[PDB]
Design a binder for this molecule. Structure first.
Ligand SMILES: O=C(O)c1sc2c(Br)cc(Cl)cc2c1Nc1ccccc1
Ligand SMILES: O=C(O)c1sc2c(Br)cc(Cl)cc2c1Nc1ccccc1
Ligand SMILES: O=C(O)c1sc2c(Br)cc(Cl)cc2c1Nc1ccccc1
Ligand SMILES: [Cl-]
Lengths: 237, 240
């Protein structure tokens, strides 16, 4: 049975995980960093070994992966970064808290956006404070006009994450390489939905815990052989 | 110039503080060596350097130096390639001995020979060596052929196994236009510098790269330096 480990980063600075941090490159807060440290200790105590790591190009996930690699003394592992594992792009909502989002767009539209799998939020427009910060960021300079989102539905996010799973990660898993993925709520949602064949409604109901190793055991067809499991002490699991 | 290349040599390690030979032993930075890396990163940040790809070894004193630099210059998203071929020189059975144990066991004449010699290796690290399984059986070297895994290295050996990685992996990226950062070690960086500047054995053995300080090369399209290496940082640090 292949082993696959996912880890979702924890808290970012300035409450930005509650502010549609999205493609804004928020760093971990001190608390989010401690979360990653605890997740790494849990992987260390459990003696996990990896052969290759995948992460996004967003520093909060990269720093999570660094903290884990440090904790488990495997800083020498190959690391692969990809925009395709980025957090969902929340468009014009990026950086707003819940109250400000409702104030701007009204409760009705907010409910529609919260429940919809395929309706995107408004695009991030040139007058958004993150517009040039994200869209002109050098790490996206190789993306084509059609690949760099101004905004994403959950469908959009999963659609651009899954090609990287199939094209880069699955081959590593099938060679027997032990994969660690440090990424974001919605990109990990895409992977989990593919793994478990979950429904749109289902995946929108799933809220992956942060800072906690998520262990999958896959059969020869990369199908889970049991439910996802979490690593940690008794209280946190 | 056509190209710019930046090297950085990691700073003090935990085993440096013990004056022990580390070589392939995976010693971490001391707090001071970590601080050094932060200052070097800040120098790169103040100069506004941008990179497209980073190379380092599979040793954490170099990897953590790279990480610290990337953090400082807000380029943690860059691709990073790690290779055993940029590891520190392998000191064979000297690995893990401190200065006194080395002088005690081998005597003044022999230690002087090993220090000055380009191609006389120190004793090999034998299966009964206290760090033999820790290093030679470390799964990170699992894909090395038996010929590739050194039991010891002369400086010549270190340079000879570093330069294939330069030629085959770094040169292509440079000529592709990618701005390279190499975070590595004294002797593997010596291999690179010797090839870049066409230095004699004697000259490369006289060269001692400063630590924690960005070393900048301006290279023409044939990767020939168009001037001497430049250290980045305030006037003080550059002077020292
Ligand atoms: O519960 C969640 O995780 C999500 S997702 C999402 C998206 Br897309 C757009 C919007 Cl306005 C909200 C949410 C949301 N909560 C929420 C935020 C503000 C006001 C009311 C509810
Ligand atoms: O006196 C010298 O010139 C040198 S050179 C050198 C090197 Br190289 C490594 C080390 Cl451990 C010592 C020395 C050393 N002193 C010395 C050596 C053996 C016994 C007593 C003193
Ligand atoms: O300065 C250098 O590059 C080298 S290399 C080497 C080797 Br190999 C074996 C030995 Cl006994 C010494 C050295 C050496 N100097 C040195 C090492 C420890 C203490 C004092 C001086
Ligand atoms: Cl990395």
């Amino acid at each position: 049975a292949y082993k696959l480990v996912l880890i979702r980063h924890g808290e970012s600075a300035w409450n930005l995980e509650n502010r549609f941090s999205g493609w804004y490159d928020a760093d971990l807060s001190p608390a989010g960093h401690e979360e990653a440290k605890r997740g790494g200790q849990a992987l260390r105590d459990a003696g996990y070994e990896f052969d290759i790591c995948f992460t996004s190009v967003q520093k909060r996930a990269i720093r999570t992966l660094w903290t884990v690699l440090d904790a488990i003394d495997q800083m020498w592992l190959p690391v692969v970064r990809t925009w395709r594992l980025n957090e969902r792009h929340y468009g014009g909502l990026t950086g707003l808290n819940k109250a400000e989002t409702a104030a701007k767009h009204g409760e009705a539209q907010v409910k529609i956006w919260r429940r919809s799998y395929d309706v995107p939020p408004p695009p991030m427009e040139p007058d958004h404070p993150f517009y040039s910060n994200i869209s002109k960021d050098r790490r996206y300079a190789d993306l084509t006009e059609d690949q760099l989102p101004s905004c994403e539905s959950l469908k959009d996010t999963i659609a651009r994450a899954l090609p990287f799973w199939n094209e880069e990660i699955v081959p590593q898993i099938k060679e027997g390489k032990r994969v660690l993925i440090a990424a974001h709520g919605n990109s990990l949602r895409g992977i989990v939905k593919h793994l478990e064949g979950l429904s749109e409604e289902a995946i929108m109901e799933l809220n992956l815990p942060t800072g906690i190793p998520i262990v999958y055991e896959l059969d020869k067809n990369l199908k889970p052989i049991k439910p996802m499991q979490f690593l940690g002490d008794e209280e946190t699991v």
